[PDB]
């Protein structure tokens, strides 16, 4: 239900400012935060730690279903906590994200993770950051937002990320490399291409706090 535990979903491609919009909404409203991309990686990090069979789906399903994960965000930085440990950096490595795509291939694991993500919906409220948040995870959410951006913009954001991790990147290689996913019919559509991220946040906040209150 809308009051009890409202959900604001934020859907879009990677590299559009979704992460940043969500951390900011979550700290402006003091709400819980679900980061969908990260949850698949935490599951795969949980799978590597407890070193379990990444075929057969039999062991990943209950892991997923009760995954001990929470997302805390203070002062703009995402803190990811698995079974107590801060695993923020651990879930960013390439091996982790390749085992996440391996788990993500079994439907029953996807359905398990879907139920785990719904269970994030609590008081006072949830900011849900993903791809299908407003269309599949929380189709009845009071506030849905779709945050798009051009391939160049997204390429640019990715370049800086890759460079921050240490790789040297070619912008034109990346752009071309980058060059389902749909707004929900009741999504507020924003484009961070020629808009500052502060403008996006302020429009998002104002939009949410006009529906919810």
Residue numbers in the entry: 1 to 179, 192 to 225
From the paper:
Cytidine monophosphate (CMP) kinase is a member of the nucleoside monophosphate (NMP) kinase family, and plays a crucial role in biosynthesis of nucleoside precursors. In bacteria, CMP kinase catalyses the transfer of a phosphoryl group from ATP to CMP or dCMP. We have elucidated the crystal structure of CMP kinase from Y. pseudotuberculosis and validated the function of the enzyme as a kinase. Yersinia CMP kinase adopts the same overall fold as related CMP kinases and is composed of nine α-helices and seven β-strands connected by loops.
There is one CMP kinase molecule in the crystallographic asymmetric unit, and the solvent content is 48 per cent. Clear density is observed from Met1 through Ala225 with the exception of a 12-residue gap from Glu180 to Ala191. The central portion of the molecule is composed of a central β-sheet, made up from β1, β2, β5, β6 and β7, and α1 and α9. The NMP-binding domain is composed of anti-parallel β-strands (β3 and β4) and helices (α2, α3, α4 and α5). Yersinia CMP kinase can be described as a member of the class of long-NMP kinases owing to the insert found in the NMP-binding domain, which is not present in short variants: in this structure, the insert comprises the anti-parallel β-strands, a loop region that connects β4 to β4, and α5. The lid domain is composed of helices α7 and α8. The ligand-binding site is formed by a pocket on the NMP-binding domain. One sulphate ion is bound at this site. The sulphate ion occupies the same position as that of previously published bacterial CMP kinase structures that have been crystallized in the absence of ATP.
